[PDB]
A paper describes a structure:
3D classification of the images resulted in seven distinct maps of the enzyme, each showing the complex in a different conformation. Initial 3D classification produced three classes, each of which appear to show a ∼120° rotation of the central rotor within the F1 region of the complex (blue arrows), similar to what was seen previously with the S. cerevisiae V-ATPase. Further classification of these three rotational states was able to separate state 1 into two sub-states, subsequently referred to as states 1a and 1b. The state 1a to 1b transition reveals a bending of the peripheral stalk towards the top of the F1 region near the OSCP and F6 subunits. While MDFF with maps in this resolution range cannot be used to determine the locations or conformations of amino acid side chains, loops, or random-coil segments of models, it can show the positioning of α-helices in the structures. Figures 3A and B compare the fitting for state 1a and state 1b, illustrating the accuracy with which α-helical segments could be resolved in the maps of different sub-states. Fitting of all available atomic models into the density map is shown for state 1a (A) and state 1b (B). State 1a is also shown in a different orientation and without the density map (C) and with the c8-ring removed for clarity (D). (B) Surface rendering of a map (State 1a) shows the bent FO region with a tubular feature that extends from the rotor-distal portion to the c8-ring (orange arrow). The largest change between the sub-states of each state can be approximated by rotations of the α3β3 hexamer relative to the rest of the complex by angles ranging from 10 to 16°. Instead, the differences in conformation between sub-states when taken together illustrate the flexibility of the enzyme, a property that has been linked to its rapid rate of enzymatic activity.
Numbering used by the authors:
A (entry chain I): 1 to 47
B (entry chain G): 56 to 61, 67 to 96, 101 to 219
C (entry chain W): 10 to 226
D (entry chain T): 1 to 58
E (entry chain H): 15 to 145
F (entry chain L), G (entry chain M), H (entry chain K), I (entry chain N), J (entry chain J), K (entry chain O), ...: 2 to 73
Write the structure that this text describes.
């Protein structure tokens, strides 16, 4: 129960929002790497 | 060490036209699958969905699409990890089946077990491998699931 | 005669109406009346049962009668004045035996010589030392049972001091109110901090004691 | 509401029977009684909804 | 000594390096990781890794999140989701981000919304710490 | 002596209210540092705080009645 | 005797206000470590700290009233 | 003197109830901060709460026995 | 009796400053064990430490005004 | 005087049981916090709690001995 | 009476240093566990320990100012 | 004057043991909660609890020697 | 009166060692819980426990100077 853990929120999620914020942070240069990491082209095959 | 009397999941690529990666996992998930209670399976990649589908049309929990053809990332790892959590399937003792690369001459479809329970980790001597909360535990249990996921994915 | 004689009947009767009214609510009516009053024992069967059993149904209602009797006896000591100084005190002494007997019913009745053999064999009392068991039998019952009289007398003291300090504050500043209203405003809030808390803790003693009864029963 | 009124009456009687208070004793207690009322009636209405619904359900 | 493995997906910063101590912003709060280690698990918050490398030299990072893994071993594993040397972050931007964060919060109105925004605030602010 | 030392005996009996006052600070402090761990505010931790401040001022009502016995 | 031991009876009654002073620090100090775990400042913990400051300074009010009783 | 000192001696042993009333504030405090760690609320911790408040009120009931002996 | 008891009556009210003495050590001590968890030192925590030290020297502003009343 | 000061001295020694009472709560409270951290309840930690109640009641039996010597 | 009550009343004000001495063990103890979580030894933590002990022994120097004003 | 004041001198000197008994509960509690975090129990830490229960009783033998001085 | 008030006044000043007694158990208690968090025992931490037992026995040495001033 952190604002997020009491938002339920995954620590992953939390974390990822952090990471997302890292990407948000940084500098242009290093923003390249943002996209390098991140994301998912995956699809939840719900079955 | 962790245990349970009880997330069997395998890791494959989205596509074939590569080795017997698929075959392995396909095999070895099923190879398991009889043994355990809470039989439920998760497939990351689909060259496992495409072979482990026969009746895994019924025993998958979710399945994940794209893997390769887009290089894996932590980012991603988190994604698949995340929703994975939300689901009442956790450990039947989870296991993760992936292709451990070793060399271009060899990989071994490897597997590890995923203790998807904090709880027995709460139990055991694991009790004092931490000496600090079934909270953060979970948020590591979490994190390590992503880390491994990433890892696995990449291997 | 009449004054003491009217007070104890009043005491009894206030617990009797709830204790009669709820038995009655088991089919009729309810209109306003029965359902309204059923809230009384629904508040008992809601509030006190959140702690009780616990010790188990067997005895639960035996204590809950005393718990309600204590709180109802205090409530009958709570708007009658003069009444808190007398009727709640006479009832605190009339509740004094019940508090003693509550450990008696299963503790001292089954083992007087070592009711800590029923209450706490190893704990506070040293199980290696039957002497300290019998000694702390006072600290867990004989004195706690005296402290339960004091615990209702603690409510009586705190309720009384509100009155007295009121009494003395409105006697000191008989201005109508006026500046005594400031202290008397405090003395009012003091009613909650003293009586309403200690009154609580008084029935909490009956809760725990009789918990310790039927928890070992 | 009717219960509350009965309890107040009983109270006043015990005062009257015993030696009249120092005026203060009564003032504080009666005020202490008053304070609960304003909250209490809001609670008292609410009480009704809970149980009669839980009764009705079973 | 402690063998510090400090890594992120991206790189390994320290790899079982005999660093004396590392100060981390676990979600526990701060924490001064010393030469051998408790069996303890810790969660990382957005704050700094200051890696007191057994040589006086200490490297700084801000880490967003991840885990430090506190072994019975003298092996310490910071697995930072990302922990970056502040080097690659920019203060000006930080401000801008924080502003936004703070701007956003105000309309963050599901707990989660608030929370994430708050992550941003908290985070962005926490960059400002050392930026 | 008789109508004197009882006035200085009610002063020493009011020193027993240094445990009912410093016991409330220890009780209603750990239920503030414990609720910081969260999220058992109602029904559990603060409910036990009512039973924590019941055995704290119980030594104080027993110390306020000891001074009241040396006055009235 | 009547005027003497009433002066030495109010002084020892002022020593009962040593529990409220150390109770005030142990109740507003656990909330100084509660917000250190964060973030319920002006929400739950700081609201209960006032309900913890009142329960401890009341045992200082019930002791200063004994000190004022043996003074007027 | 012979009648004076018993009154001054009963209050002095009533100051020994300041240790029992704060020792109950520490035992019930560390149980309120011992239940936040979870989860065995019933048994173990709060069952030893009365077992820790028995040896700490044992110093009060012995002290209030030395205060009552100088009164009766 | 009148002037004699005014000397051993402000001396017993001077031992009431022991609550404010250790209460300031419990308040400022928790702030030293709070900013160690970091990092809201400037404002939030040390600003609240000035609210806790004033509410602990408040009992010190009521106990030192008692002994200064029995003096002159 | 001689049969008087023995009653205004045996009572002041019962104020030495304030450390034995608040020492029993602190030694048991941290035992209730130590067994909340788990798991060696049966011996090792609660066994040492007996070795902490003894070295804390020893400064309460030596203080009760001096009070009993000035009364009998 | 005018010189006798000045020797036994300067002794009761020496019990006000019981707060400055127990409070100093709380202002330094909560600094020992503070630097244990580390790392700001010089500055921040130990600097806040000096501003805390100064506000702990201040109730010891003012209490020894009311002690020496009764004997000198 | 001579035979009486020595009985009301070893009585107030027994109120110095109120720290040796509570401080031993503080050190043996911190060794009870300290060994919970593990693992240096049969060395290092419980060998520091003997060095703590002695320094606490060091003001409990220095205070006890003064109460044995005023009596015999 | 001249030999009486200096014999009962030297006893009241011995209640200033109750602060240094429990103040020594806390500074040696937080060093037991601090070295439990490990590992800078020799130097830094256990070298500060001497700096914490010296500032606590300084009020003890200040209180033992007062009781020896009315005794010799």
């Amino acid at each position: 129960v952190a604002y997020w853990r009491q938002a339920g929120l995954s620590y992953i999620r939390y974390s990822q929002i952090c990471a997302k914020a890292v990407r948000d942070a940084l500098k242009t240069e290093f923003k390249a790497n943002a996209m390098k990491t991140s994301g998912s082209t995956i699809k939840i095959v719900k079955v | 060490d962790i245990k349970t009397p009880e997330l069997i999941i395998g890791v494959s690529s989205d596509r074939g036209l590569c080795g017997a990666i698929h075959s392995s996992v396909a095999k070895q998930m099923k190879s398991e699958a009889a043994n355990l209670k809470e039989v439920k399976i998760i497939g990351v990649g689909d060259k496992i969905r495409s072979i482990l589908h026969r009746t895994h049309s019924d025993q998958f929990l979710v399945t994940f699409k794209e893997v390769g053809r887009r290089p894996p990332t932590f980012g991603d790892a988190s994604v698949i990890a995340l929703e994975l959590l939300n689901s009442g399937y956790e450990f039947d003792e989870g296991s993760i089946i992936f292709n451990r690369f070793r060399s271009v001459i060899s990989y071994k479809t490897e597997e590890k077990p995923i203790f998807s329970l904090d709880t027995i980790s709460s139990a055991e001597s694991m009790s004092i491998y931490d000496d600090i909360d079934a909270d953060v535990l979970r948020n590591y249990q979490e994190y390590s699931l992503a880390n491994i996921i990433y890892y696995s994915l990449k291997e | 005669i009449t004054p003491v004689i009217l007070g104890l009947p009043l005491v009894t009767l206030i617990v009797l109406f709830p204790s009669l009214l709820f038995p009655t609510s088991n089919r009729l009516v309810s209109n306003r009346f029965v359902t309204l009053q059923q809230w009384m024992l629904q508040l008992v069967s809601k509030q006190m049962m959140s702690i009780h059993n616990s010790k188990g149904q067997t005895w639960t209602l035996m204590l809950m009668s005393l718990i309600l009797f204590i709180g109802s006896t205090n409530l009958l000591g709570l708007l009658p004045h003069s009444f808190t100084p007398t009727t709640q005190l006479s009832m605190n002494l009339g509740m004094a035996i019940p508090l003693w007997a509550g450990a008696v019913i299963t503790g001292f009745r089954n083992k007087t010589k070592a009711s800590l053999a029923h209450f706490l064999p190893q704990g506070t009392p040293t199980p290696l030392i039957p002497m300290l068991v019998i000694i702390e039998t006072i600290s867990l019952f004989i004195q706690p049972m005296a402290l339960a009289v004091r615990l209702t007398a603690n409510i009586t003291a705190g309720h009384l001091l509100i009155h007295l300090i009121g009494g003395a504050t409105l006697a000191l500043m008989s201005i109508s109110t006026t500046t005594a209203l400031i202290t008397f405003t405090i003395l009012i809030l003091l009613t909650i901090l003293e009586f309403a808390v200690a009154m609580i803790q008084a029935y909490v003693f009956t809760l725990l004691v009789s918990l310790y009864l039927h928890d070992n029963t | 509401p009717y219960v509350l009124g009965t309890g107040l009456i009983l109270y006043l009687l015990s005062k009257e029977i015993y030696v009249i208070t120092p005026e203060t004793f009564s003032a504080i207690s009666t005020i202490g009684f008053l304070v609960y009322i304003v909250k209490k009636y809001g609670a008292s209405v609410g009480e009704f909804a809970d149980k009669l619904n839980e009764q009705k359900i079973a | 000594q402690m063998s510090f493995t400090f890594a992120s997906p991206t790189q390994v910063f320290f790899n079982s390096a005999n660093v004396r101590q590392v100060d981390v912003p676990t979600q526990t709060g701060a924490f001064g990781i010393l030469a051998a280690h408790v069996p303890t698990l810790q969660v990382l918050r957005p704050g700094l890794v200051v890696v007191h490398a057994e040589d006086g030299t200490t490297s700084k990072y801000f880490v967003s999140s991840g885990s430090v893994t506190v072994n019975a071993d003298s092996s310490v594993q910071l697995l930072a989701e990302e922990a970056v040397t502040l080097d690659m972050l920019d203060l000006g931007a930080a401000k801008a981000n924080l502003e936004k964060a703070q701007s956003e919060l105000l309309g963050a109105a599901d707990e989660a919304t608030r929370a994430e925004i708050q992550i941003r605030i908290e985070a962005n602010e926490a960059l400002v710490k050392a930026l | 002596i008789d109508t004197a030392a009882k006035f200085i005996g009610a002063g020493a009996a009011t020193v027993g209210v240094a445990g009912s006052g410093a016991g409330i600070g220890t009780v209603f402090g750990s239920l503030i540092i414990g609720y910081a761990r969260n999220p058992s505010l109602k029904q559990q931790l603060f409910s036990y705080a009512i039973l924590g401040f019941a055995l704290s001022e119980a030594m104080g009502l027993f110390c306020l009645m000891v001074a009241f016995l040396i006055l009235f």
